[PDB]
Structure formats: structure tokens, C-alpha cells
Amino acid sequence: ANFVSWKSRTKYTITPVKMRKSGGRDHTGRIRVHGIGGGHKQRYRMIDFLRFRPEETKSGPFEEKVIQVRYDPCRSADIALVAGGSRKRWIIATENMQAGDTILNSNHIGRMAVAAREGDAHPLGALPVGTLINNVESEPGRGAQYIRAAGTCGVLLRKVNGTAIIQLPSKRQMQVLETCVATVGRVSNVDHNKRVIGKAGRNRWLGKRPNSGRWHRKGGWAGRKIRPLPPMKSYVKLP
Amino acid sequence: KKRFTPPIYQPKFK
Amino acid sequence: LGQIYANNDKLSKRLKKVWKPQLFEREFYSEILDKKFTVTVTMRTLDLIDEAYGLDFYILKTPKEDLCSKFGMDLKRGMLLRLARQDPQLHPEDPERRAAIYDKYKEFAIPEEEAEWVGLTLEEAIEKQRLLEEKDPVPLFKIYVAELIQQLQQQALS
Amino acid sequence: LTYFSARKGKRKTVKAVIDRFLRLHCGLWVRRKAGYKKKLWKKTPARKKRLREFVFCNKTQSKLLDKMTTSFWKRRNWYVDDPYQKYHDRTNLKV
RNA sequence: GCUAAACCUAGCCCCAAACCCACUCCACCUUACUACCAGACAACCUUAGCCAAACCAUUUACCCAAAUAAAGUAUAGGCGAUAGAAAUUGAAACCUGGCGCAAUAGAUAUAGUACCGCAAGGGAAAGAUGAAAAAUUAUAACCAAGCAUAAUAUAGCAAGGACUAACCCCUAUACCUUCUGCAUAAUGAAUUAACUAGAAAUAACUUUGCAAGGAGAGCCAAAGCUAAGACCCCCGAAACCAGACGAGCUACCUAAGAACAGCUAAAAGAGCACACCCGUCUAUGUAGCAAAAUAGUGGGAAGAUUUAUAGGUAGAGGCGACAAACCUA
RNA sequence: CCUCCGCAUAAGCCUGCGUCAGAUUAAAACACUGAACUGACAAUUAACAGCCCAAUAUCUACAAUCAACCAACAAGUCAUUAUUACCCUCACUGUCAACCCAACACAGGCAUGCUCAUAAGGAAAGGUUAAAAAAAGUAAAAGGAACUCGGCAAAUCUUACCCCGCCUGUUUACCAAAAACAUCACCUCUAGCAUCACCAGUAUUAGAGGCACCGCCUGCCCAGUGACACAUGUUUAACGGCCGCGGUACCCUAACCGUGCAAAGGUAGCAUAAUCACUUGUUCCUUAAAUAGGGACCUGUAUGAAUGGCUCCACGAGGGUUCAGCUGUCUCUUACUUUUAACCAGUGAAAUUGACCUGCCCGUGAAGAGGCGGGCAUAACACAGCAAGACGAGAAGACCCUAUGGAGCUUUAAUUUAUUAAUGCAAACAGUAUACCAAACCUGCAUUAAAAAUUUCGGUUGGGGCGACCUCGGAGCAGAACCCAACCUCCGAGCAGUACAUGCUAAGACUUCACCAGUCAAAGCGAACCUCAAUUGAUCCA
């Protein structure tokens, strides 16, 4: 088997990139994941998840201008093309972002919390307690891995001596360093639950194969399980 | 079951 | 790579078993080589080094059938060549320390031309010998002129 | 019974026969009674006495054991204090 | 008298002895047999199983020092099928053969060619004058089945007893195997030629030699020991395991392509309907045109569609809108 | 007269109907001389098509659909710049054909462009005759499904109802296309996360499953098993389950009661159903006639709710019933045409075959005779038919049984954990005031679990299965030495009680038809002066 991943390019760019499908196959050529294959062709828009990243030879916080809000075939939520200084990038559009708005990406953490409109990114310590937040990291400067899906949102619960506590959409709570950047507001493309597929053909266009016709008898896992919430997740190292 | 016996070709030189 | 019985009784199943050594990464110093090596080591060879009183002594004392390592045989050949050559081992300005390290291992240092072929596989030995006898061909012009001048001298001296 | 062995081409011997029977040089085989040391608490003294006996074998059994053993076990032995020395020969037997 | 028949010698086999090979020029690891360009990756690993143990579940000779003997002994072992040493002993340098085959034999061999297979792989058949063919002459015939010369004659396992006469008279239920028992309408067999199936020990028996000893070391011996003779078939599964070879069919996927008339267009995994894909029902066919076809009739035909090209996943597996489907009939 | 063809390119193939000679021979399914050929000779000429490019950075948000209005989703098929380097040129390869994959000059398979009937390309009839049977058509009086399992087929154009599945779609290449599988919708379970799938994704997500659009609903139960919690619990849209007797008025249950048990005792709904049998249940419509169809009743004692229940729109080569029509389906068949057929000419198979000089009736017999017994019949020999027999040909029956012959699958069959994942201990490390903490990866051991692996699935048996039995003794059968079967008739046994010489030895005997086992016993040495019928278990090994 000769499998080379399409994710092979070391320079960020705005133009969409051709992405090869997989069919649920790993590098060996065998099926690793079932029900995947053969949908509409797509191109990849590169999303800059490190929301606060200053340009070259520039250091402090910066402003940006929402040039457009576009549909992304590769994700649930839509993506905003946003320009600033002399460079443009794709980011995850939050709700009520439209063309012509201005967005603030700030680093300095304040003695007193700041008032943030629904599109800016501040360190979680600078934000008011109880705000709805999205695109959060775990280490400072790691980049946004948590909440990123359409309409989903998390809430900052408390601030501790050097950390901040955040509730995830699955209600699990996690503590991150105070200097961890996150964006204010809920993610755009709400009402994504109400989407009705209508027919199996639309699933096929979406690129998911039908389920196996073999009849599996249900085991002990099948009944409803009422478990307590899992313990706190902590991302703060301590000697 | 489906019992089938494929035919046998003799060598062409004969 | 052997086999075992299920509960150490022969009337049970026979299962193929593998026993692996417990390997550790440790750092060593060679007084002859004046270099620090990081090697994947085990408790047995740590104990052997302790018994031999030093990595240099362990490598120079243990035979190939016991070192069981091409790395060990290469180290042995390096130390043997150093001892046979009596070369400027440590550095200038430390001749007495160099000599002291050399005399710590007098019961060694086989001749120079013999210490080269120590720890060499058959392929390495054949390659070394082939590059030894490279000897690109000599033109026949020189041979013929030497023969003719020797003939001329023979005829003239008579 | 391995009439021909894969190493020497020789006849082999069954060692169970050797472990269970004694061969006199005349051709007679001597055995022990079965059950002579099993459940002696349910047996009468006469039964136990007849079970403790060393008895001879059939003609058929003797030929079978001769086939199952090799000629090494049929040679004439001259042990020092053999308790069966006098039994290795036959006397006053007519045809 | 046609078809035919017949023939010796290509070569081969088993030993012995001896350690054996390979660049004329050019091309050849990429799609081998390709004159000429910048990531330099790289091998070292306990076989298993059939089978035997009358099942099978521990176990079951097979490994590379001349012989012989110790010895099938010590030992091992569901202590059972069977497995099985060593110490020790001692093992005379040189000689080119055949109670081997002779074209269905002997090598598969005229050749690993033709042919078959995608591939790994499998694998044939056959020739005959003579000193001279720069003697094409007349000889050389005679011999299997099959025929021809030359169809037939009431009635009957095909004949036998006969008889002056072929038939007519009288008598007569093919063979082999398998069975309690077969003419059995139970098996097998068209027929000819060739090929095609009993291998050995312990202990006995007979015939010699020598004889309380025999034997050319070892072993046996209260007439034994030594030697010889005589003696135990052929074909056939469904299986299991190891290592290769296969996705040019088909299942699914990846890359990059192509096709879908006309009408109604409700907007459409909408309707009629071509091309195109499929295969409902009937008839034919059934050694067929075809190892799944033909004619008609049908389902779909802008989609979860059909389809060309290249690539990927492989058997203790792959792939599967699970039919135990498909993975070269 | 036909054309549903053809001409190109791609792919495939590789000289394979060009000329001359041999045609005496040889393949031509026959022939002339050329598609089923032998030798020699000759040809496919690049512009078409292949065969490409100097680096290092940098750039590349705005589909297509006449791209213009409009309108979307499944979100898309095409672009540079900056600097350095660079002044030689038209090489090489494919180019033929009646052609490829199917063993064939095979009614099969085969991508794209072009005209969609042609300006390409082709020939269904060797000759004759006009039988049967067979194939494909055409026409048919009167009737019009009376045929038949069934309106199969054909001809005409077609109304209404029901069951199942929502629908389009998929499937057993080669006997099943469906009600089976999928499917939008609904629901359960698992997962807090970055570079090789999932995914360049992040709980409105991803994955493992059930059920099956929608509409109304989905009732009770955690006793048991499984799974999750280690606080003795939670969980059924998890595996699954949702009572019994008796008294109960003339008929029936029955509301009701006494009781027992359980986790709950089947709720709604629907209902003789694709739902064990009874069963052609009862009843109305439908027909002249109704084991068919539709509508109602619930003992459905085995219906029933995501094992989803019940209605309904649309749909269906699904399975049933029906009006009307019109049809050779049929009463009831007939005529013609073509193929086939039969004869003449050419070429020329296969299954099969012990040998055959190969009759009928009755009987016999390994129980169904051409061949045997008794009768009868009987010159020889082609051609066309037919299918009663030759227990006709084909395939060493697939059904059944057997084999200490296999294999697939499932487990709660036996054995094991080599492997993966968890734990615990050990090894490896390091500070620490007489105590403690033990990061991660390896390695050894032990336990647990998942996944598996190997192997087997007794026998008797008036076939096998099911039932019953398997060892030992007494009686009968088996009457008077011994023996003697039965899935034959009847009884029993798997102990018990008392001494502790129930010590030791040893002639001679018996013997359950073998062996192994089993039985009796004189004398003797010692010491006083054994009942009972069976009452049982080898070797190895412990």
C-alpha cells in the first residue's frame, strides 16, 4: 500500500486546499472506520485556531476586520475571513459576526475585568465570571481545541489564584491557566440540530455509507446508565 | 449445495 | 525462545514463551579512550564491570564469545590500537598522566599489526584486505624500459 | 512394537513386559497376581495367600512376551546370589 | 489387401573417481534486456501439521562425528504408544564398473519447449531403409483389434453331443465381485496392444560345517553354535499445516475523467420515455450460439445512477445497504 | 432484400483475405481460388499522438450551470510575482489488417466522438418435396375464463378492496428480487482530545448499536444474568418476564372474597391474523354453487406495544380477491407461412456398448424374465414413426443409517492463556526527619478480563431418534451331567452381624466356556482344647 496523507504543506495560506478522501482506511489500506466514503468533493480552508498571534515585528494586542462570513464544508460552524494589518486569515465565526465588524485580540490581563463584545478573544482571567466562551485552549498558546462546533458554547465559572474554571458543553469542568486565551460568545451556525436529512441520498452526499445489515443482539451496555459527572479535569502542572 | 464440475480440455496437440 | 508447560506439569498444554532481559541506559567512561559513552546495559554486565574494576578492564578482559556485541569488540579494538601505538592519547601537556593510564594496562597491547584485525567480521576483513591490495596497474612502458636498460648494461659490461 | 528402529534397524523391546515379568532360561515367565495389594481388608486370608503367589504364564502369553522382548533378555545369567537360580533349568520333564 | 505390424539407439540410471562453473562487442533492478542527473529505506528471529497412540488432550524416530561392538543395554515416557545414549572398542594409502533401462522403459525431456494458467504454477507427444538416395530398383510377403475380398435364412449365453449334411434333433440360467443366497433387472467391463498389485523380523523347520563348544574380536552355549533356504500387496477421500501467488472477475474504497435524446418541466433520490444499466414472467435451449444464451415482455433511466483508466485492502484474512454474498467460471 | 448499422479514436492484438509461385498433397466444415495455408517478396514515411520543464522564496476568499436577472447546496474541475541562471534547435517512438476478451471464423462481453438511416456496411434460401411430431407467427363461426393452482400465454386496456414493506434504493454473478437488507425519523451506549485513519475534526462532534418516515402511543417489573457504581445501589427504547386454586343464582364468566407466590402478574391497542393445533371457528356481504376475498365476536391458555403496537398518504415486475372489457385459455379445434422435417449432394460428432443368432402368455425364481419350466408364435432384409419395457442413459443417492471419517457455527463441553488490557509484588531510580512518599517507559512473577486456540461429542437398539438399559446374584424358559439367547418372564444386591490364630505354610483339585480374575482343601508349624447369595473395580499413579 502507498498511502500519503493530503495534509502535507508547511505554510499557512488562505486559498482552499485540495483534500483527498480516505474511505475509513488507514495507511495500511484496511478499513479502520466503518461507514465512511464517497461524498461530494471538498476543499480545505485553513482555520487559524491560535486567535491571538501578532504579526512579524509587532508585539502587542491588535484589531481585525471581518471581511466575510462563509460556509465551510469541512465543519459544522461557518468561518469568517478576517483581515488585519497586512495579512488575512480564516477563523471560526461566532454568532452575530457579519462583514464590516471589528474584532479585538488582546493579551494583557487586567486588574479588573473588561467588557467584551461577542467576537473578541481575551485571556480567561480578564473576562467576567459567567460569560459564554468558545474556542478555548488547555496550555497558554496551545490553540483552540475545545468548544468549536456549531452553536455550542461553554461558560467560565470561577477564577482561582492562578487558574480559571470552565464548563464544557458536555458539562465536564476543567481548570486551565489564567493566561489561556478564549473567544467570547457562542459559536455560529445555531439551529444545526434542526437540520433534517430528508433522505439517504443526502447522507450519501455528506459522505457516510449505510450501516451493516447484520443483526447484532444487544448486550449489557444497552440499558440506560445514570452516572455521576466525571471529576474535574486539571491542566495546571504542580511540582 | 451447488455441485458443479468444470469441463476438462485435452491438450491441443492431439 | 523456548516453551513451557501450563502449570509446570507435563500433562498440560505446551506454550511458546520468550524471556527478555531487563535493559537500562547508562553512561560509561573509558580511561584509554578518554570518552564518555551512553550504552544500553543490563545488570549482568554492570556486575561484570564491577568485578573487572572498570569498563576498560572489562572490555579488555572479556572474550568475543562473552562480550556478545560488535560495539564491545570495536571498543576493544580501539583500546588495543591505542595501547599498541602508545599515541598521544589524553592531550599534550599531560604526558605523565597519559603514561600512567598506559601502564595501568600493561598486560595487553598485542602488536600493532595484530590489533587492527581484532573484532572484525569476515566481510570487514575481506574489504580491508581488498583495499590493502588495491595497487593500480603499472604501465608496461616502465617494465620494458627497465628490462632494456638492464640488457644494455649486461651487454656493455662484458 | 518397532520391528525395525529408525536408528539401527534393530528390533526393540517393550519395557512394560520387562517391568512386570521375569523370564526363566527354560522359557517360563513368572508374574505377580493382579490386585495382590489392593483392598486387603475385604479379602480372606486364603485369597490373600493365593494372591501373594508368583505364578507361571500360558504358552500363548509366553510366546507373546518372547516376541515383545529382545534376545538379550533370554540369555543365561550367572548372578551371584540369584533367588531364582535353581528355577532357570527344567528337570524330569518328558516331551 | 488396406489400416497396420516389426526393428536399435538416441539417450538415461546406479556407483566409483575428482571439490565445479561462469566478461568477444552492446543491453539489462525504470514497464528487466531501456546510453546520459541531487534523499542517501535495507537481512540477521523456536517451524507447524499430517500421522501413531486403533478417539484425543502430554507424548510420536527424521538432527549431518567413516564402519563394527557395547546395545536396543543404561535411561525417558498419558511408565504407554513409543523414544533411547555414553564410557569404552576399533575403522589398511593406488586400480576407468554393471545377473541396470532400451522409445508406454530409462531423466519430465527431441523440452522445461509446445500447450494450459492473471500469477505462483502445471506440463506433453514423438524416431526407425540401405555400403552408397550423386542407387528411387522393385520387391520381399507372412502377424492384434477394425474392415474388404464375401450381408442375410424359423429357434433362442451362441456351444456341445453329434451327424452323410452348415442349420434343423437333444442338453445347457455369460463372467467377476459381493453375499445367507445373484441368470439376476446388484457391481464392473465396447474391443485390441502395452503397462499395471506380497516388501521383513523374533522364534521355529530343513539342509551343511564344527562340536562341550561354535563363530574371521563384540555374542550365544546343561548340544549347542555358525551358514543358507523359506515370509507379511495396489489404487482411492473429504481433511490439516507451512510457505508462496492472486482485487485485469467480483466486494468496497482512493485519484483524476466521461455519459444521460425527447415530452411533461410543480421544485423533485418526480412521471412517460431513447441510448445505457438491470433481469420480472413466459417460451426456446439443456454436449446449447452460450460451463447461464436467444426472442418477447418487463424494473430503472439527473441519481443511494451508469461507466472508461490507474491505484489500495488477501485467506487464522479482505470486503459485505448480512445474501453464510463476493474475493479469476 | 437487410441495416440496432457504420467510420474514426482509445484499449487490446501483433502481420493474421497485398503480390507471385505450389496447388500433386495439405486446413477451405464442399468447391472455384482465398478469411480456417505453404514458401518468397513487399509495406505503416509527421504536421496527428506520445516522449517535457533551472532554482530559491512568494502569491492564489469570490464555482459551474449561454453567467446575464433569480435561486440555492452537496460548497466546487483550471491564475502569479520577486531575484539569479539561460542565446544551441525539429531527434526518438506508434502509424498495416477482415483485429480484442470468451478453448472456435462463438446469437455472448466491449470506453468515447460523429450521421442517427445512411454517401457506411451487408445476405435470412446447397437443391427438392410439402408427411407426422416439434418451434415461431398469422386468421378464425358461436360462446367469452366455462381453461387453469393461478387470466400462464395471448388479446384488449383496465374498476374496487386487503395483507406486508413508509417511500427511491440493495441482495443469494449461475434455480429464491421478496414481506429480507438498507433507509430519512426516533432512541440507547462510549469518548474532554492534536498530528498516518477517526480528523488537518472537538459534545449541535465523533464512534458502537437498536428500531424504522410521518400521525397517536410505547403500559408494569432490577427477583435472575449482563453492564455501570464498590456507600449493597442504578439500569429494561439492556438479555428478558408480565400468576394459581377454591366459593362463587337458575348459563356463563363474573364484580367480590379466602389464600399462596412473585419483580410484576399483559396495560392501551388490535385480533382466527404470514400468529401451534382444534380450524373449512361463528356470522353478514359477495357467487347458482365460496376450504377463496372483504366487514364484525373474543379461550389470542401460544397477540401485544423501538422482539415496537395501531391507523393512514404515496409507492411496489411483492402476495391475495374483484367489476367491466376481450381474448384459440377453453367448449373444440382448423387453415396457411417460415423453421424444423423427409429425399438428393458435400462435410461430418457425442453420451452409450459383457457378448447377443435380442418374441408373446402363464408359472417360477435374490420375491417384477427376450434368455428358466409348460404352451403358443416364427422365411430374410431396409425406411418413417411412437415411447409401454429393456428395474433405459447421465451423476460410486443429496433423503436415511453407519465410520472411535471431516468441516462450518454456538456455547453454560473439556484444556490453556502463548497474545492484548488492567491491577499487585519484584528489579530500576532519586531526596527526605526512629516515619513516609515510589513519575514514566522497559523486564520478571502472580491475579483478573477480553479475545481466542486445540479437541470431542459412548454404546445396545426388529432403521435411527425418543423412551428404556449397560455391573453382580437367585428362579423359569433350559423337566434327569455341563452349557445355552431374548428391548423375554419374575425376584434381589452395591450390605450387615460375631470373633480378632479373619495366624503361617502346603499335597491335590474346581472354575462362569479364553485370559485376567474367582473357588475348595488334606498333611504340617503354631493356638484353644466364621454366618451370609450377590454385597463389587485391573494397571499406572497418589
Ligand SMILES: [Mg+2]
Ligand atoms: Mg443506525
Ligand SMILES: [Mg+2]
Ligand atoms: Mg439492522
Ligand SMILES: [Mg+2]
Ligand atoms: Mg490417531
Ligand SMILES: [Mg+2]
Ligand atoms: Mg488404524
Ligand SMILES: [Mg+2]
Ligand atoms: Mg473422529
Ligand SMILES: [Mg+2]
Ligand atoms: Mg560411543
Ligand SMILES: [Mg+2]
Ligand atoms: Mg520417455
Ligand SMILES: [Mg+2]
Ligand atoms: Mg515423459
Ligand SMILES: [Mg+2]
Ligand atoms: Mg485382423
Ligand SMILES: [Mg+2]
Ligand atoms: Mg434347441
Ligand SMILES: [Mg+2]
Ligand atoms: Mg443382500
Ligand SMILES: [Mg+2]
Ligand atoms: Mg440360482
Ligand SMILES: [Mg+2]
Ligand atoms: Mg449382473
Ligand SMILES: [Mg+2]
Ligand atoms: Mg453395491
Ligand SMILES: [Mg+2]
Ligand atoms: Mg457401465
Ligand SMILES: [Mg+2]
Ligand atoms: Mg483427523
